[PDB]
Ligand binder design. Structure first.
Ligand SMILES: CCCCCCCCCCCCCCCCCC(=O)OC[C@H](CO[C@@H]1O[C@H](CO[C@H]2O[C@H](CO)[C@H](O)[C@H](O)[C@H]2O)[C@H](O)[C@H](O)[C@H]1O)OC(=O)CCCCCCCCCCCCCCCCC
Ligand SMILES: CCCCCCCCCCCCCCCCCC(=O)OC[C@H](CO[C@@H]1O[C@H](CO[C@H]2O[C@H](CO)[C@H](O)[C@H](O)[C@H]2O)[C@H](O)[C@H](O)[C@H]1O)OC(=O)CCCCCCCCCCCCCCCCC
Ligand code: CLA
Ligand code: CLA
Ligand code: CLA
Ligand code: CLA
Ligand code: CLA
Ligand SMILES: CC1=C(/C=C/C(C)=C/C=C/C(C)=C/C=C/C=C(C)/C=C/C=C(C)/C=C/C2=C(C)CCCC2(C)C)C(C)(C)CCC1
Ligand SMILES: CC1=C(/C=C/C(C)=C/C=C/C(C)=C/C=C/C=C(C)/C=C/C=C(C)/C=C/C2=C(C)CCCC2(C)C)C(C)(C)CCC1
Ligand SMILES: CC1=C(/C=C/C(C)=C/C=C/C(C)=C/C=C/C=C(C)/C=C/C=C(C)/C=C/C2=C(C)CCCC2(C)C)C(C)(C)CCC1
Ligand SMILES: CCCCCCCCCCCCO[C@H]1O[C@H](CO)[C@@H](O[C@H]2O[C@H](CO)[C@@H](O)[C@H](O)[C@H]2O)[C@H](O)[C@H]1O
Ligand SMILES: [Fe+2]
Lengths: 28, 441, 34, 31, 306, 97, 74, 31, 27, 37, 61, 27
C-alpha cells in the first residue's frame, strides 16, 4: 500500500504547485 | 587607426562591430581572414607531410588532411597503398603561397584603401538596407560555389579518378563514367529518415551517388546564382526577414552550425566518402571486425549458429553479443559475405578471402578508443599506447564548433531583431510597453 | 496500428502548419521613432 | 641541432610579432 | 476581423492570457503535456524492461515493488539501438512496453518542448520590449540535456545509454560513465564543477552584500567588499557585476555539456597511469592509480558477460 | 487622429503601430490629393508606406489618387518601396550582348 | 605610496634585478645539489626499494615510530 | 620602506620566486 | 483493507481541503 | 616524407602551423599599445 | 642544382621576412606609401620572380 | 511498517494544519 502513499504525496505536491501558479496573492 | 569608444559607442572588446558601416575595412578583414585559413591549410599540409612515413597507414599517426587528398585519389594505389608523396607537398606549398597573396591583398584593403567603396566604386559598393545588391553578391558567390562543385565533378569524371573503396579486391583509384543522375534516388537521401538504419544523407554507399548529387547541386547553384543576379526579393520575402548585416550574419551562423553538426555525424558514421583505409575504422566497423575476426579464429581452431551469431528482431542473421547494436554496419570487406537474408552461413563457410581477414585484424586492433592524454585503449587501461582515431578528433571538434556557432546564431539573431525593432539599447524609462498593459491577477 | 499512425500524423501536421503560418502572419519589425 | 634551429625560428617570429607595433609607436604611425 | 483565423491568432499572441502562449507555445505545450503524461503513467505502473536485451527484465515501475528513489523509466532496450520505435512499429503494445518505447517517446517530446520553450522565452522578451538574449543564458541546461539524452546515445550507437528517468537510475548512469570514461579527470568536467561552485559562491555573496546594503549604501557595500579582500576596484557598477554573475555558470555548464558530448565519441579524460617510474623500471602508485583501481572495479562489475 | 498616436506602442502581433494608423493616413493622403496638395501627398503616402501599408494594387490603380499620380516622385517612391521583381531591362540588355 | 613612482625608481630596478636571479639560482642549486631530498626526506629514484624491503613501507607504530622509520628508510 | 604592504608583498613573493626556480630546475631532473 | 484506507483518506482530504480553499479565497 | 631537396628546412616547417594562433595575441598587444581606448 | 635550390630558398625566407616587416611599417605610417610605391612594387616583383625561379629550378630536378 | 505510516501522517497533518490555522487567523 506504500505505492498509494507515494502517489498521494506526489499529487498533493502538484496541487500545491498549481495553486501557487493560478491563485497568487495580489501585491499589498 | 581605430575609432574611439565615444565616437562609435563600442568598447575595444567589441571592436570589430565598428566595421558594420565601413566597407573597405570590412572587405580587408574578410580577405585577411581567408588568407589566414589558407595559411593554416598550407602549413598543416607541409607539417603533416614532414611527419609522415608511407609505410604505415595514415590513421596510425594522427593524419586529418592527407586523407582528403588521398580520397581525391592522388598518389594512392590499390588497397590504399601510398605511391608518391609529391602531390601532397605541391598541394601544401600552392596553398601557402596563395595564402600569402590573399594576406597581402587583405592587408592592403584593410590598412590603406577606400574605407567606403560606394562613393568611388559603385559596382562594388553596397548598403545593408539595400536588397538588389545583396542578391547580386549572393548570386556571384552562388555561381562561384557551383563552379567549384562542377570542378570536383570534372576531376572525378576526367583527368584522373577518385579513390573508390567499394572496388572489388579492395579500394583503388577509379574513373567514374555513369553517375546516378536520377532525381528520385538523389532526393530520397534528402527525404530519408535520420534515425538508426536510415541515417539521412549519411547512408550514401556508392561514389556514383556522390558524383550525381554533386552534379545536381552544382547545376542548381549555378541556376540560383543566375536567378538572384537578375531578381529582387518577393513582397513576402521582404515582409518576413530583417534586412541588416547582423541579420545576414545570424542566418549564416545558423546554417553553418547545422552543417557542422551534419559533418560531425557524417565523419563518425559514413565510410564511403571517408574510406576506412585512410581515416580508420568507425566504432561499428571496429566492433564488427572484432566479431568477424573472433568467428574466423574460432572456425579455424575448432575445425543461427550459436558461435557468435544470433537473429535480429527483424529476422536477419547478425553477429552476436554486445555487437548486435551495430547490426546495420556495412563495409567493403563484409558486403560479399552478406546474403539477402543478412549473413548467410555458406558464405563464411566457403567464401573467405585473405585480405578481408587481415583488414579485419588491423581494424579490430585499432578501435576508435582513446583518451585526451593521447593514450589509446579504455580509460582503465593499465599500460600505455599512443593512439586516438582521427575520426574521434574530427567528430568532437566539429560538434563543439557547430554548437558554439548555433549559440552565435541565437545571440546575433536576437540582437538584430531587437535593433530593428528599435529597443536594443534598453527600455525608454518613459513609455514602458508593460505599463500600457493591465495588471495581471 | 495504422489508425493511430494516421491520427498522430494528422495532429502533428496540423500543429506544424499552424506554427509556420503563424510566423508567416507576423509583420516585420520596425522603428517608428527612428 | 634541429632543436636549436626551431628555438631560433621561434625567437625570430616572436620578435617580429611586436616589432612592427613597437616601431609604429616609436614613429608617428596611426595605431 | 471576426474570422476564425483572426480571433484564434489574437488569442494565441495575446498577453492577456495567464501564461503567455505565443506561437512557439503551439509546439511547446502539447509536447510537454505528452511527455509528462507518458512519464507519470509509466512511472506509476509499467512492466519491466529488457535494458540489456538478453531477456533479463529490469523492474523500474513504482507499482512493481520499488520505491521513489529506485523507481525509474528504463531506457530503450539495447536490441533496438538507434532505430525509430514508436507504437506503430512494435508488434504489440506488450512487446512495445517490454522493449522500452515510452522512454524514446518521452525523450523526443521533451527535447522538442525545451527547444520550443527557449523560443517562446525569446518571443516574449521581444514582445515586452526587454533585451532579447535570455534564451542564450537558457542554452546551458538545454545543451546539457541534449548531450545527456541524445548526443551520448548517438555516439555510443544505442539508446540504452541515455540517462534513465529516475534518481537511482541517474546515479547508476553516473557511476557507469565514470567506469567507462574518466569524467572526473577531464578538464571540461572540472570547468563545469568550477562553474557550479562559483555560481553558488557568487549567489551567496551577492545576496549577502545587497541585503546588508539595503538599509533605511551601494558605495558602503563596495567599500566593504574592497576592504574584506585586497581587490578594491572590483565590480564598480551593477551592470558588470550582474553580467559576470550571468556569464560564469552559463560558460561552466556549456563546457561540461561539451565535455560529455566529446566523451560520447570516446575521447576520455586524462590517463595518468604508470606516470611515475623509479629507477630500473618499477611502478610507484599515485592517487591516479587508486582512482584507476576504482574505475576498473566499476567497469568489470557492470559488464554482465553472462 | 494622427495627433493622438501613442508613443512607443508595441502591438500584440509586433505591429509597432495601431491598425487604424495606416488606413487613416492613407485617407488623409487621398484627401490631400483632393485638396490639390500633391507635394505633401507624396510625403503622406511615403509615411504611410513606412507605417506598413503593404497593399500595393489600389495606390497604382485607384483613380481617386490619379491626380497626384502624375508627379514623377510618386512613381519614384512607389519603385523604391515596390521594386520590380524581375529586371526585364537588364536581362534584355544582357541578351543583346 | 602609489605604484608608479616605485616602479620607475632606478634603485628598485637595480636591487630587484640583482636579488631575483640570486633567489632563482638559490632554488636551482637547492634542488639540483640534492639538499632538498635530505632535508625533506623524499627518497631519490634509486632507493625506494631497499634490498631488505622490496614492498611499500608500513608503519604499525604510534609512539615508538622514529627508529621504525629509520629501519624503513635507507 | 617597511610598511605592512611591503611586508605582505615580500613575504608572498620571496617564497614564490624561490619555489619557481626550484620547480623549473626540478623539471630538468633526469628520471 | 487497502480499499477502506484509501476511501477514508480520500473522503478526509478532498472535501475538507475543498472547503479550506474557498474560505482562504473569501478572506 | 618531405622531399630531400627541402630536408634541412624541416625545423621551420615544424613551427609554421602554430603561427595563426599568434595573430589574435598580436591584436591584443596592439590594443595594449593603443591603451585600450 | 641542389645547392642552387638551397640558396634561392634561403633568399626566399630572407626577402619574405623583410617584406613582412616592412609592409605594415610603410602602409601604417602616414604618407609612407604614396611616396614609396616603387620600393614595395620592386620588392613584390622580385619576390614573385624569384619564387618562379625556385619553382623552375625544382622542376629541373 | 505501522510506525512509518503514523510518522508520515503526523508530519503531513500537524505542520500543514498549523500553518493553515495561522493563515486563517491572519485573514
Ligand atoms: C600546451 C601544449 C600542448 O598541449 O601540446 C599537446 C600536443 C602535442 O602532444 C603530443 O602529441 C603527439 C601526437 O599525438 C597524436 O598522434 C598519436 C601518434 O603519434 C596518436 O596516433 C594520435 O593521433 C594523437 O595522440 C603525441 O601524442 C605525444 O605523445 C604528445 O606529447 O600539441 C598539439 O598537438 C597541438 C595541437 C593542439 C590541439 C589543436 C586543437 C584540436 C581540436 C580538437 C577538438 C578538441 C575538443 C575536445 C577537447 C577536450
Ligand atoms: C533532428 C535531431 C536529430 C535526431 C536524429 C539523431 C540521430 O540518431 O542521427 C543519426 C544520423 C546518422 O544515422 C546513422 O546512419 C548510419 C549510416 O551508416 C551506414 O551507411 C553508411 C553509408 O556508407 C556506412 O556504410 C555505414 O557503415 C553504415 O552503417 C547508420 O545507418 C546508423 O544506424 C544511423 O544511426 O545522423 C545524421 O544523419 C545527421 C543528424 C544531425 C543532428 C544530430 C545531432 C543533434 C544535436 C542536437 C543538440 C545540439 C545542441 C543544441 C544546443 C541548443
Ligand atoms: C573579394 C576580394 C576583393 C575585392 C572585392 C576587391 C575589390 C577591389 N580591389 Mg582589391 N585585391 C584583392 C581582393 C579584392 N579586391 C586581392 C586578393 C588583392 C591582392 C592581389 C588585391 C589587390 C588590389 C590592389 C593593389 C588594388 C585593388 C583595387 C580594388 C578595386 C578595383 C578593382 C580591382 O582590383 O581591379 C582588378 C583588376 C584586374 C585586372 C584583375 C582582374 C583579373 C583577376 C586576376 C581575376 C581573378 C579572379 C579569380 C576567380 C581568382 C580566384 C582565386 C581562387 C583562389 C579562388 C576594388 C574595390 C584597386 C583600388 O582601387 O584600390 C582600392 C587597387 O589599386 N585591389
Ligand atoms: C583576424 C581578425 C581580425 C581582422 C581581420 C581585423 C581587422 C580590423 N580591425 Mg579588428 N579586432 C580583432 C580581430 C580582427 N580585426 C580582435 C581579435 C580584436 C580584439 C583585440 C579587434 C579589435 C579591434 C578594434 C577595437 C578596432 C579594430 C579595427 C580593425 C580595422 C583596423 C585595424 C587597425 O587599426 O590596424 C592598425 C595597424 C596595425 C596594428 C599594424 C598592422 C599590423 C600587420 C597587419 C600585422 C603584421 C603581420 C602581417 C603578416 C603583415 C602582412 C604581411 C603580408 C603583406 C605579406 C581592421 C579592418 C579598428 C577599426 O577600424 O574600427 C573602426 C578598431 O577600432 N579591431
Ligand atoms: C564579379 C563579382 C564577384 C565575384 C566573381 C566574386 C568572387 C569571389 N568572392 Mg566576392 N564580392 C563581390 C563580387 C564578387 N565576388 C562584391 C561586389 C563584394 C563586396 C565588395 C564581395 C565581397 C567578398 C568577400 C567579403 C569575400 C569574397 C570572396 C570571394 C571569393 C570566394 C573564395 C572562397 O572562399 O570560395 C570557396 C569556394 C571555392 C574556392 C571553390 C571555387 C573553385 C575555383 C576557384 C573555381 C574554378 C576556377 C579555377 C581558377 C580553375 C582552376 C583550378 C586549379 C587549376 C587552380 C570568390 C573568388 C571571399 C574570399 O575569400 O575572397 C578572397 C570573401 O571573404 N567576396
Ligand atoms: C545559400 C544560398 C541561398 C540563399 C541565402 C538564398 C536566399 C533566398 N532565396 Mg534563393 N536560391 C538558391 C540559393 C540561395 N537562396 C539556389 C541554389 C536556388 C536554385 C534552386 C535558389 C532559387 C531561388 C528562387 C527561385 C527564389 C529564391 C528566393 C530566395 C529568398 C526567399 C527566402 C528563401 O530562401 O526561402 C526560405 C525558405 C522557404 C520559403 C521554405 C521552402 C524551401 C524548402 C522547400 C524547405 C524544405 C525543408 C524545410 C526544413 C521545411 C521548411 C518549412 C517551410 C514551410 C518554411 C532568399 C533571399 C525567392 C525570392 O524571393 O528571391 C527572389 C525566389 O523566388 N531563391
Ligand atoms: C564568423 C562569425 C562571426 C562574426 C563575423 C562575428 C562578429 C561579431 N560578433 Mg559574434 N559570435 C559568433 C561568431 C561571429 N561573430 C559566435 C560563433 C558566437 C558564439 C559565442 C558569437 C557571440 C557573440 C557575442 C556574445 C557578441 C558578439 C559580438 C560580435 C561583434 C564584435 C566582435 C567581438 O566580440 O570583438 C572581438 C572579441 C574578441 C576577440 C574576444 C575573444 C574572446 C573569445 C572567448 C576567445 C576564444 C578563443 C579560443 C582559443 C577559441 C577556442 C574554441 C574552442 C572552444 C573550440 C562582431 C559584429 C559582440 C557584439 O557587440 O556584437 C555587436 C557580442 O556582444 N558575438
Ligand atoms: C590587419 C591586422 C590584423 C590581421 C591581419 C591578418 C590576418 C593578416 C594575414 C596575413 C597573411 C595570411 C599573410 C601571409 C603571408 C605569407 C607569406 C609571407 C608566405 C611566405 C612563404 C614562404 C617564405 C615559403 C617558404 C617555404 C615554402 C614555399 C613551403 C615550405 C618550405 C619553405 C619554408 C622554404 C590584426 C587583426 C591582427 C590586427 C590589426 C592588423
Ligand atoms: C550532395 C549530396 C546529395 C544531394 C544533396 C541535395 C539534393 C541537397 C539539397 C539540399 C536542399 C534543397 C536544402 C534546403 C535547405 C533549406 C533550408 C535549410 C530552409 C530553411 C528555412 C527556414 C529556416 C525558414 C524559416 C522561416 C520561419 C520559420 C519564419 C517564417 C518565415 C520562414 C518560412 C522563412 C546526395 C544525397 C545525392 C549525395 C550525398 C550528399
Ligand atoms: C611565411 C613565413 C614567415 C611568416 C611570418 C609570420 C606570418 C609572422 C607572424 C608573426 C606574428 C603574428 C607574431 C605575433 C606575436 C604575438 C605576440 C608575441 C603576443 C604577445 C602577447 C602578449 C605578451 C599579451 C599580453 C597581454 C594580453 C594577453 C592582453 C591583456 C594584457 C597583457 C599585456 C597581459 C617568416 C617570415 C617567419 C619566414 C618565412 C616563412
Ligand atoms: C587558395 C588557392 C590555393 C590553390 C591550391 C591548389 C591546390 C591543387 C594542387 C593539387 C596537386 C596537383 O598536383 C599534381 O597534379 C597531377 C595530376 O593532375 C599529378 O600527376 C600525378 O597524379 C597522380 C599521382 O598518383 C597520377 O594519377 C597521375 O598519373 C600523375 O601524373 C602531379 O603529381 C601533381 O602535379
Ligand atoms: Fe542583484
Amino acid at each position: 500500500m506504500e505505492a498509494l502513499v507515494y502517489t498521494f504525496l506526489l499529487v498533493g505536491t502538484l496541487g500545491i504547485i498549481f495553486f501557487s501558479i493560478f491563485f497568487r496573492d495580489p501585491p499589498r | 587607426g581605430g575609432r574611439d569608444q565615444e565616437t562609435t559607442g563600442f568598447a575595444w572588446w567589441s571592436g570589430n562591430a565598428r566595421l558594420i558601416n565601413l566597407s573597405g575595412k570590412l572587405l580587408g578583414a574578410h580577405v585577411a581572414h581567408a588568407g589566414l585559413i589558407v595559411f593554416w591549410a598550407g602549413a598543416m599540409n607541409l607539417f603533416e607531410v614532414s611527419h609522415f612515413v608511407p609505410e604505415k597507414p595514415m590513421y596510425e599517426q594522427g593524419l586529418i588532411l592527407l586523407p582528403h587528398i588521398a580520397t581525391l585519389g592522388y598518389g594512392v594505389g590499390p588497397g590504399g597503398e601510398i605511391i608518391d608523396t609529391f602531390p601532397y607537398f605541391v598541394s601544401g606549398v600552392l596553398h601557402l603561397i596563395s595564402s600569402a597573396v590573399l594576406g597581402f591583398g587583405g592587408v592592403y584593403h584593410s590598412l590603406i584603401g577606400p574605407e567606403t567603396l560606394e562613393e568611388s566604386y559603385p559596382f562594388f559598393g553596397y548598403v545593408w538596407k539595400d536588397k538588389n545588391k545583396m542578391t547580386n553578391i549572393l548570386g556571384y558567390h552562388l555561381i562561384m560555389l557551383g563552379l567549384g562543385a562542377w570542378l570536383l565533378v570534372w576531376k572525378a569524371m576526367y583527368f584522373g579518378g577518385v579513390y573508390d573503396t567499394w572496388a572489388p579486391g579492395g579500394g583503388d583509384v577509379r574513373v567514374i563514367t555513369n553517375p546516378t543522375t536520377n532525381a528520385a534516388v538523389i532526393f530520397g537521401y534528402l527525404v530519408k529518415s535520420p534515425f538508426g538504419g536510415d541515417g539521412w544523407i549519411c547512408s550514401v554507399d556508392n561514389m556514383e551517388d556522390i558524383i550525381g548529387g554533386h552534379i545536381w547541386i552544382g547545376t542548381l547553384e549555378i541556376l540560383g546564382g543566375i536567378w538572384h543576379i537578375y531578381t529582387t526579393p518577393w513582397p513576402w520575402a521582404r515582409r518576413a526577414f530583417v534586412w541588416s548585416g547582423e541579420a545576414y550574419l545570424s542566418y549564416s551562423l545558423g546554417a553553418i552550425g547545422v552543417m557542422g553538426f551534419i559533418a560531425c555525424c557524417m565523419s563518425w558514421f559514413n565510410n564511403t566518402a571517408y574510406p576506412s583505409e585512410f581515416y580508420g575504422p568507425t566504432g561499428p566497423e571496429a566492433s564488427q571486425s572484432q566479431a568477424f575476426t573472433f568467428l574466423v579464429r574460432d572456425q579455424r581452431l575448432g575445425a543461427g549458429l550459436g558461435k557468435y551469431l544470433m537473429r535480429s528482431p527483424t529476422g536477419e542473421i547478425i553477429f552476436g553479443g554486445e555487437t548486435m547494436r551495430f547490426w546495420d554496419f556495412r563495409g567493403p570487406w563484409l558486403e560479399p559475405l552478406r546474403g539477402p537474408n543478412g549473413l548467410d552461413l555458406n558464405k563464411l563457410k566457403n567464401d573467405i578471402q585473405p585480405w578481408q581477414e587481415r583488414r579485419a585484424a588491423e581494424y579490430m586492433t585499432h578501435a576508435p578508443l582513446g583518451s585526451l592524454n593521447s593514450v589509446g585503449g579504455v580509460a582503465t587501461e593499465i599500460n600505455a599506447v599512443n593512439f586516438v582515431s582521427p575520426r574521434s578528433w574530427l567528430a568532437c571538434s566539429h560538434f563543439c564548433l557547430g554548437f558554439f556557432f548555433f549559440i552565435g546564431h541565437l545571440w546575433h539573431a536576437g540582437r538584430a531583431r531587437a535593433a530593428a525593432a528599435g529597443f536594443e539599447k534598453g527600455i525608454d524609462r518613459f513609455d514602458e510597453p508593460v505599463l500600457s498593459m493591465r495588471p495581471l491577477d | 496500428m495504422l489508425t493511430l499512425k494516421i491520427f498522430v500524423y494528422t495532429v502533428v501536421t496540423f500543429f506544424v502548419c499552424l506554427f509556420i503560418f503563424g510566423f508567416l502572419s507576423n509583420d516585420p519589425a520596425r522603428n517608428p521613432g527612428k | 641541432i634541429e632543436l636549436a634551429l626551431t628555438l631560433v625560428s621561434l625567437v625570430l617570429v616572436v620578435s617580429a610579432g611586436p616589432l612592427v607595433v613597437v616601431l609604429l609607436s616609436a614613429r608617428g604611425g596611426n595605431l | 476581423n471576426s474570422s476564425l483565423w483572426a480571433r484564434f491568432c489574437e488569442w494565441i499572441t495575446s498577453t492577456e492570457n495567464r501564461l503567455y502562449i505565443g506561437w512557439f507555445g503551439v509546439i511547446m505545450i502539447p509536447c510537454l503535456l505528452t511527455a509528462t503524461s507518458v512519464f507519470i503513467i509509466a512511472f506509476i505502473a509499467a512492466p519491466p524492461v529488457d535494458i540489456d536485451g538478453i531477456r533479463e527484465p529490469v523492474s523500474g515501475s513504482l507499482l512493481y515493488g520499488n520505491n521513489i528513489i529506485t523507481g525509474a523509466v528504463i531506457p530503450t532496450s539495447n536490441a533496438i539501438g538507434l532505430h525509430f520505435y514508436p507504437i506503430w512499429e512494435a508488434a504489440s503494445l506488450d512487446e512495445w512496453l517490454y522493449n522500452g518505447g515510452p522512454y524514446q517517446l518521452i525523450v523526443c517530446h521533451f527535447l522538442l518542448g525545451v527547444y520550443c520553450y527557449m523560443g517562446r522565452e525569446w518571443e516574449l522578451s521581444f514582445r515586452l520590449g526587454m533585451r532579447p538574449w535570455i534564451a542564450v543564458a537558457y542554452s546551458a541546461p538545454v545543451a546539457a540535456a541534449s548531450a545527456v539524452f541524445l548526443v551520448y546515445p548517438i555516439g555510443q550507437g544505442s539508446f540504452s545509454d541515455g540517462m534513465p528517468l529516475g534518481i537511482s537510475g541517474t546515479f547508476n548512469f553516473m557511476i557507469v560513465f565514470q567506469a567507462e570514461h574518466n569524467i572526473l579527470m577531464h578538464p571540461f568536467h572540472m570547468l563545469g564543477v568550477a562553474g557550479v561552485f562559483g555560481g553558488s559562491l557568487f549567489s551567496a555573496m551577492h545576496g549577502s552584500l545587497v541585503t546588508s546594503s539595503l538599509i533605511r549604501n551601494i558605495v558602503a557595500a563596495h567599500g566593504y567588499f574592497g576592504r574584506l579582500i585586497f581587490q578594491y576596484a572590483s565590480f564598480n557598477n551593477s551592470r558588470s557585476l550582474h553580467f559576470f554573475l550571468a556569464a560564469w555558470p552559463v560558460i561552466g555548464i556549456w563546457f561540461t555539456a561539451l565535455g560529455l558530448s566529446t566523451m560520447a565519441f570516446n575521447l576520455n579524460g586524462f590517463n595518468f597511469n604508470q606516470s611515475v617510474v623509479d629507477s630500473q623500471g618499477r611502478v610507484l602508485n599515485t592517487w591516479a592509480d587508486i582512482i584507476n583501481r576504482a574505475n576498473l572495479g566499476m567497469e568489470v562489475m557492470h559488464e554482465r558477460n553472462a | 487622429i494622427i495627433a493622438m498616436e501613442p508613443r512607443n506602442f508595441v502591438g500584440d502581433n509586433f505591429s509597432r503601430n495601431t491598425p487604424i494608423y495606416k488606413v487613416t493616413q492613407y485617407n488623409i493622403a487621398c484627401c490631400y490629393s483632393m485638396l490639390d496638395q500633391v507635394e505633401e501627398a507624396i510625403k503622406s503616402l511615403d509615411a504611410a508606406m513606412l507605417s506598413g501599408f503593404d497593399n500595393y494594387d489600389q495606390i497604382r490603380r485607384d483613380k481617386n489618387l490619379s491626380k497626384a499620380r502624375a508627379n514623377p516622385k510618386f512613381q519614384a517612391v512607389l519603385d523604391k518601396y515596390d521594386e520590380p521583381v524581375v529586371n526585364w531591362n537588364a536581362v534584355k540588355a544582357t541578351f543583346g550582348a | 605610496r602609489p605604484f608608479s613612482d616605485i616602479l620607475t625608481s632606478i634603485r628598485y630596478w637595480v636591487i630587484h634585478s640583482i636579488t631575483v636571479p640570486a633567489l632563482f639560482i638559490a632554488g636551482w642549486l637547492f634542488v639540483s645539489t640534492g639538499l632538498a631530498y635530505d632535508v625533506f626526506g623524499t627518497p631519490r629514484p634509486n632507493e625506494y626499494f631497499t634490498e631488505d624491503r622490496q614492498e611499500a613501507p608500513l608503519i604499525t607504530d604510534r609512539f615508538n615510530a622514529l627508529e621504525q622509520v629509520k629501519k624503513l628508510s635507507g | 620602506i617597511f610598511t605592512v604592504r611591503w611586508l605582505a608583498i615580500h613575504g608572498i613573493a620571496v617564497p614564490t620566486i624561490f619555489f619557481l626556480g626550484a620547480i623549473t630546475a626540478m623539471q630538468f631532473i633526469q628520471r | 483493507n487497502i480499499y477502506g484506507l484509501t476511501a477514508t483518506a480520500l473522503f478526509i482530504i478532498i472535501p475538507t481541503s475543498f472547503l479550506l480553499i474557498l474560505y482562504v479565497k473569501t478572506a | 616524407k618531405l622531399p630531400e631537396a627541402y630536408a634541412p628546412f624541416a625545423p621551420i616547417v615544424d613551427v609554421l602551423p602554430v603561427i595563426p594562433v599568434f595573430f589574435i595575441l598580436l591584436a591584443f598587444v596592439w590594443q595594449a599599445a593603443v591603451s585600450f581606448r | 642544382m641542389t645547392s642552387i635550390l638551397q640558396v634561392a630558398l634561403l633568399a626566399l625566407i630572407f626577402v619574405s621576412f623583410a617584406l613582412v616587416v616592412g609592409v605594415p611599417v610603410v602602409f601604417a605610417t602616414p604618407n609612407g606609401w604614396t611616396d614609396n610605391k616603387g620600393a614595395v612594387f620592386s620588392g613584390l616583383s622580385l619576390w614573385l620572380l624569384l619564387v618562379f625561379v625556385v619553382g623552375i629550378l625544382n622542376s629541373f630536378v
